[PDB]
Amino acid sequence: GSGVRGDFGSLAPRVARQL
């Protein structure tokens, strides 16, 4: 229920103006 959809592979975000 409280999982998280996505495909194998971990990664982070990629901002420029944000922290």
GROMACS .gro file of C-alpha atoms in nm:
model
   19
    1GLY     CA    1   0.000   0.000   0.000
    2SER     CA    2   0.254   0.254   0.118
    3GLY     CA    3   0.535   0.137  -0.108
    4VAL     CA    4   0.671   0.318  -0.411
    5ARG     CA    5   0.637   0.248  -0.781
    6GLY     CA    6   0.946   0.233  -0.999
    7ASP     CA    7   1.187   0.005  -1.181
    8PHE     CA    8   1.503  -0.153  -1.044
    9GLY     CA    9   1.777   0.102  -0.993
   10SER     CA   10   1.835   0.359  -0.720
   11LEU     CA   11   1.906   0.724  -0.787
   12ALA     CA   12   1.844   1.076  -0.661
   13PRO     CA   13   1.696   1.396  -0.805
   14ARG     CA   14   1.875   1.641  -1.031
   15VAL     CA   15   1.797   2.005  -0.964
   16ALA     CA   16   1.990   2.321  -1.043
   17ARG     CA   17   1.814   2.610  -0.873
   18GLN     CA   18   1.698   2.400  -0.581
   19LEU     CA   19   1.917   2.276  -0.298
   0.00000   0.00000   0.00000
